[PDB]
Symmetry: D2
Subunit: 284 residues, 4 copies
């Protein structure tokens, strides 16, 4: 997987037949290599219609999700593997090449205590199976680190690497998010350096989830590190500029993050491409 | 209220006799003008002892707090006023010059929805009462903006200014935190600029709660904005480097933020001092 | 003088009749409020032609120059006054609102020694007289600070301010350039802050003279300081992307700075507008 | 060659017996692994005395110079080789492990035109010879890129790499300077990235030649790049804080760069060490 991506959330998080059409077609209009398709309601995902759309617009896909609470792997590793395998099935049916995101827990997950090795054993058992399942489908399996307020288990790139190395699969990659690294990494570039080998996917997101280029992410440190490690993965824009008011609680976002989705699509995607160009990402 | 401050959490969040002594003495060893004293359990605090130690060590103080959930002002405004007024009595008894922090709500406060006008009405009425009570004590009253994961009501400087202006009280000030602004402000310095009439207190906190100067906060933008708006208040280091493991759930902190408090104190307080001098803060 | 400007060097440094139309039309084409028109040798400039085009395309103008060595005010103040006064006449004729740039010396000027008081006296005498002439013509007079390798006299905003204060005119303003400030200012925002009473003109120039947004200028600190001090002048793009190889020695530019002027105009002018909006420079 | 260095200009560029003592003792007092010793007046240096002071305080050294104008390699390549080998002999006698700096030209060198192929042919010839002489001495040979106003020949990391590769020697490294990179590199970390194969030496220098961490150099981008490419050479602080006012012309510095050398050494070396630890450089 290599190139520029846009998260389907730039148009919607639904994936009914015309939500899929609007996001895929729009991602083709912005000349992206990949679209990131959220898997929220797995039953209501039409993989044949989606695959038809992807092939019509010449667009590759990766899938992402956050584990719902019944399926959090730190406490319920068996419902985790169930949910993760049923989402991998839908991702493979659809033509997507990977499942990534918060595949090990929730974005509202909290015990009140530090992570315990029992929790990590649960994560390791659950994730080694669903990754093994991903292998049979030819898929790669992503682990995205999020900030301390969303999850207590995988916050830094170092925790993500250590978890990957414990599972010991060969198709798991580390997925990092500049919105989360802006808090969790002691110098954002250290997260990219720490993940080095396993880093194949980036959420390129401004510090306020608005427009990359107009916030506090140190983008020159980010692209410097990405270039110097020889990154050949996907750079996917993630912004909450299109998120509906209905979604506020699920993303702890209580006010507008930007002026509107189309300005974020214009200025944000151009910014990532221009900055990729300045640092010769993919220039080898 | 002007100068360099350090939050007492660099030594402990506890405030019994021995922790009070250790925190105040520590602040004095690092030449600070202010110590920020947290008010967690008001009955367990010996204000006259604290007052005597502040004078012995020649230290000024600000108190700070987070409202416990029975007293969140957005839903329980009358309980908020009772808790804040008792907190202000203890602050005044200590000889503190202000009560600041999350004086309007919690740091685990969330409705699941955007803040409503009713919630802001409750906040407005409650804080007018307690700032009024603060005024009778000779104390200023601060509103600290915190990030979207801790509270849904006051996240950006603009929300803080707007609430301050709704209250209309002459002794309220905006209190900004670089850790929170690093997420909430569209360009951190825009927060300082938005708040320029009311900004009198800063938490200078690195983006990972570690050591200022060694993370993701754009300190030159912070210090330029502070200098250009003419800032005259207190610059208070806040770091989690001394926090005990038992605090983890309270501060949503799951792993060490730095090596130890002694290094954060040494390097972080010097970094703040050297940047202030570079940008001629305070002249 | 307020708004968004672009230097005519994005199309050519020659101001013959058709260079002027393609420069004025280009700046009009990119929505700019101002064009900055260079005055290299004054007899070459057809002022009647230019005022017509400025009227036609709805475009205001400022003129800029660098003193030629026979007229360096450091050493030859009366030659400087004659040169400045003649350029002021041409600027007034074509309807420019100001003459700015290195109006006090050269961009390859040095003595091998730090600037002396006698040198500043010569500078004061010349700029005093020529700023008076400019005042009679309704024109403001600008002094642009440049880095230590171009000139030994006016490098920091502080030096520019102190000179403007010496002269005591009311129509002299400080002109700063982010390319030179990136070297000269101890924290780029400190230059803007130092000039807050006099800053009416910016060259917004990337650290390598390329494209704003793609270099080492800390634009967040630049724009925050501009907003915080309430800047109301002109933000003018300076880039060398259109300079021909034959200008190399005059601008110490030995290799490409970008991939053509059109890209710099597209991305650089948009960047300055987008950042000015982020920090509410003009509303 | 690895560790933290300080340029002897922090105490003086005169290398008489007492100034060498003050400098080398100073760099020891600040716990440095290296001191960078400038070579300007060759007959005035006691190599035996310096080697002694180095070995006494357990300090490693690299030498640096700028070519005097009669020996600018671009136009006078035979004079350049003569001068470089002379400095190299002195460097090896001192116990230094490399000769670096503007070893190919001047800091006021200017033709009025962009660099020519003929000039680069001259550079390649003189540098390949003098690097050959360095190898027989057990020394490495450094090439420092400087900004467009001091030199028209080696300004970007990319030009330094191209030159190094055309010489084809084993013991030539690229040497960068954040003060010059802050003007020349399109994103300062791009210079470190482009020079990755050959970068063995840094001048860690603030944008105004003052105190590192208190100017415009994007230090997190610098250190990120250095960490990400696996840099394992020398980080040497360069600052004009100790320079006398009679040096102004040689360095085009017309006003103080900081309040004093002592605070630059105290704050700058501390800042570089703290950032090096933050990014796990060594
Ligand atoms: O950034 C994220 C939320 O913290 C993750 O990328 C989520 O998966 C996001 O909602 C996209 O699926
Ligand atoms: O930053 C903060 C938490 O969000 C607060 O300022 C402190 O933790 C608290 O208010 C101090 O009493
Ligand atoms: O930047 C400048 C000189 O270094 C000035 O703005 C000049 O006016 C510009 O180069 C055109 O002469
Ligand atoms: O940065 C430099 C001059 O521009 C070089 O490091 C000089 O050679 C310095 O004086 C070293 O001796
Ligand atoms: Mg993400
Ligand atoms: Mg705080
Ligand atoms: Mg200029
Ligand atoms: Mg150097």
């Amino acid at each position: 997987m290599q190139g520029f991506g846009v998260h389907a959330m730039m148009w919607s998080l639904n994936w009914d037949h015309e939500s899929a059409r609007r996001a895929i077609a729009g991602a083709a209009d912005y000349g992206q290599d990949f679209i990131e398709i959220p898997l929220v309601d797995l039953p209501s995902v039409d993989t044949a219609h989606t695959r038809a759309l992807l092939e019509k617009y010449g667009l590759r896909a990766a899938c992402s999700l956050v584990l719902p609470e019944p399926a959090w792997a730190s406490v319920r590793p068996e419902a985790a593997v169930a949910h993760l395998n049923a989402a991998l099935d839908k991702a493979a049916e659809m033509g997507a090449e990977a499942l990534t995101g918060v595949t090990y827990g929730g974005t509202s997950e909290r015990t009140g205590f530090p992570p315990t090795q029992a929790e990590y054993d649960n994560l390791t058992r659950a994730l080694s199976q669903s990754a093994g399942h991903a292998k049979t489908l030819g898929l790669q399996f992503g682990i995205e680190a999020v900030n301390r307020y969303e999850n207590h288990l995988v916050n830094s790139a170092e925790q993500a690497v250590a978890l990957v190395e414990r599972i010991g699969a060969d198709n798991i990659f580390v997925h990092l998010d500049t919105f989360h690294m802006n808090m969790e990494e002691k110098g954002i570039a250290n997260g990219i350096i720490a993940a080095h080998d396993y880093l194949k996917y980036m959420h390129m997101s401004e510090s306020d989830r608005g427009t990359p280029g107009f916030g506090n992410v140190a983008w020159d440190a980010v692209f410097a590190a990405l270039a110097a490690i020889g990154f050949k993965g996907v750079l996917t824009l993630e912004s909450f500029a299109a998120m509906p008011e209905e979604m506020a609680g699920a993303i702890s976002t209580w006010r507008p993050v930007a002026s509107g989705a189309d300005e974020v699509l214009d200025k944000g995607l151009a910014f990532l491409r221009d900055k990729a160009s300045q640092y010769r990402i993919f220039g080898n």
